[PDB]
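Q: What does the assembled structure look like for these inputs?
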Amino acid sequence: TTMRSDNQALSAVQDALGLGAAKVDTAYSGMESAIEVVKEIKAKLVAAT
Amino acid sequence: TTMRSDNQALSAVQDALGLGAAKVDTAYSGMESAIEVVKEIKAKLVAAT
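A:
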């Protein structure tokens, strides 16, 4: 009974980890977009010299 | 990523170098024209002495 309860808890933790992975993927995609935009800004500023 | 940003910066530097080369070429052409005109002036004056 205790091991079955622990297995259910582990399944819940796995679902939470999937949710967290989705959040991290979204945030990292935003980070990549920010990297690209910042690189473009730096290139424009260098051309502005 | 840092190298790609540097490559973009060097591309901007190349564009700036091309613009500066065009400016220098125009200035040099005008300078040569002025030199020729002043040489003509000197020839005329030494004829007029």
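The CA atoms of residues 5 and 11 of chain A lie 10 Å apart.
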